[PDB]
Each structure stands twice: as C-alpha cells, then as structure tokens.
C-alpha cells in the first residue's frame, strides 16, 4: 500500500520567528524550469537594470 | 435630590464604572490580573505629604452654567486636554460650600444659578463638604501656594503594585508593570474611563463618617486603583512592546518614578507642564483626606 507526496512547511518547531515562508514558494520553484549559472546572472542582471 | 444613602452614593448602581474589556465590559476588580509585576533594584521611600494652604479662591458668578465635574475627570485622565487650568470655573464652584446659596449641583455633574424642577441633584449639605476641599486644587498654579510632584509618585506605585507586605512596611522596590494586550488597549481605557462621572466617587468621599468610611475604603479599593493605573501611564518613560509565541505584550516601564514626560507620545495618553501642575495638586488633596 504505497506513498504519496506532501509538504511540510517545517511546522514541527511551534517556535516562532523562524520559518517564515510557506509551502507556496517551493511549487513555482519546481514550476520554473530549470537555471543555468549564466542564466541565472542574466535574470539578476535584467531585473536590476 | 436623593438625599444620600447611608454606606455611600456609590453603592446606588444608576451610575458604576466598567472598563471595556474589549468587545465585554468588566469589574475594575477582575481587570487588575491580567498584568504581573517585575521588581527591579531600584528602592522608593514612602514619603511624608504636606499640608494644603487653606485659600480657596474667592466668590465670584460670573454667568457660564460651568462643567465643573466635566472639567475635572478631563484632565487627569482626558485625551490630550487643552487649557485646564484656567481660573475662571473653580472659583465659580467655591460659591457651593457657602452655607445658604441659590446654587445647586446638578447629578449629571452640571453646576446652576438658583435652581430647576426637572432636573434631581445632590442635597446641598454633601456638596457643602465637597467644595469645602476640591475648590482649593482650583489655585494650585500659583507660584505661592503650588504643589509638589516629583515626590507625591512614591504613593502611586504601592497601590498599583503595592504588594500587602510593602503597604505595610514603608518601601517598595521599584517594579515594571506587564500585562496582555490588544494594540490601542492604552489609550482605549483612557478614553472608557472618563465618563465614570467620577464626582459621585468624591461628593461622598467627604460625606461618609467612622463606620460608613471604614466600608467604603474597604470595597471601593479597585475603583481607585484604576484610574490611578491609568494616571501612571502618562508619566512611566518607555514602552515595550513583546512579541511571544502568538501573543502581543505592553510593558508600562516604571510604575513608581516620574519620568517627566512622554511615556509614548504614540503608544498612550501624555501630559503637558500644566497637566503636572494639576494631577500632582489633585493627588495631594484625595490621598491625603484617602488616608
């Protein structure tokens, strides 16, 4: 009787002032494609600009 | 009239005092809880008080059907009052302790020429008294006659904080008050506690003899100690916000000292030069005929 897939959001520390982001910004992570080094210093480089 | 019931005109109920918890009204009683106490290594001494000069200021009517009850409760715990100590309206309530005068205090804390029907107020033999002492603060500006400040706050403290053993012996370490909070908490108690109509509070406490006086002391010891709290917030330096868990804390800095001003410009209510110049005759009038 297999798995599944789930997140966390690290709420297992009930201590406040760290965890601050949630589950949310790990999905448009995985959404994006993927960065290579000069891509990555290219987006920097536009959003700067 | 109303005559005066016997063990106070605040055991009545038509007019008591709630502070708003929030969205429940409660007992001054079951509010004072909700705060703890810090003591720090700082010591007070409890210091002797002097006597007031007697020289009320003289009679006078000009025409102004005056809010001398109004005026009063505005002060001392009022939002950012404007022009309090201003002569004109005590010497106009110094005319009442006069024995036969055409002048009666109103209930609703009105004063008037002559008199009216419609409207009930206190018999003229217990706002006789009243004025006989609360006329005085009226002159307590007076580079003379005026009052002390820095010292009268080694009192406010014992009661707010005033651990049995403490009010007992004669000092009390400086503490630093605490309590839960909800953000404009401050200054929302000070705007519920000023329509207490705190003249019935006073118009009886110089009203009430041996035994009515020993029971009155004795059950109305919170109904003071609030607006006592309420007056140390003004004149405390710092405010101190925690942010635990998911609650929200205020810290009142010192609950003994008069730090001479601001306490938190925005966090609660603050006190002007002639708001020292009230408070501290006030205070010198109330504890000393309160003890």
């Known amino acids: 009787r297999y798995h599944e897939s789930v997140l966390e959001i690290a709420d297992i520390f009930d201590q406040a002032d760290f965890i601050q982001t949630s589950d949310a910004v790990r999905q448009l992570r995985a959404l994006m494609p993927t960065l290579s080094t000069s891509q990555i210093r290219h987006a920097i480089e536009r959003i700067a600009q | ?291």
């Open chain 2, 1 to 291: 009239m109303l005559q005066q019931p016997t063990g106070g005109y605040t055991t009545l109920e038509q007019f008591a005092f709630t502070i708003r918890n929030d969205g429940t009204n409660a007992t001054p009683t079951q509010f004072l809880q909700l705060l703890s106490y810090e003591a720090t290594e700082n010591e007070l001494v409890k210091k002797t008080i002097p006597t007031p000069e007697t020289h009320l200021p003289s009679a006078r009517n000009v025409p102004g059907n005056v809010y001398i009850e109004d005026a009063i409760t505005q002060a001392l715990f009022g939002i950012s009052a404007q022009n309090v100590n201003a002569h004109g309206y005590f010497s106009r309530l110094s005319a009442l302790a006069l024995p036969n005068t055409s002048a009666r205090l109103g209930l609703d804390g009105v004063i008037y020429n002559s008199e009216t029907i419609n409207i009930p107020f206190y018999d003229p033999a217990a706002v006789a008294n009243f004025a006989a002492t609360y006329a005085k603060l009226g002159n307590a500006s007076t580079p003379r006659y005026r009052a002390d400040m820095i010292d009268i706050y080694a009192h406010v403290g014992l009661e707010l904080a005033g651990t049995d053993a403490e009010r007992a012996a004669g000092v009390m370490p400086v503490k630093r008050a605490k309590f839960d909070s909800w953000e404009g908490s401050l200054i929302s108690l000070s705007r519920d506690v000023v329509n207490w109509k705190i003249l019935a509070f006073l118009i009886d406490l110089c009203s009430l003899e041996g035994e009515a006086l020993r029971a009155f002391k004795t059950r109305n010891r919170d109904v003071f100690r609030m607006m006592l709290f309420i007056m140390s917030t003004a004149v405390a330096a710092n405010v101190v916000n925690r942010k635990v868990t998911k609650r929200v804390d205020r810290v009142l800095e010192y609950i003994g000292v008069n730090s001479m001003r601001t306490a938190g410009r925005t966090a609660t209510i603050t006190y002007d030069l002639s708001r020292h110049e009230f408070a501290a005759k006030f205070l010198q009038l109330t504890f000393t005929r309160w003890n």
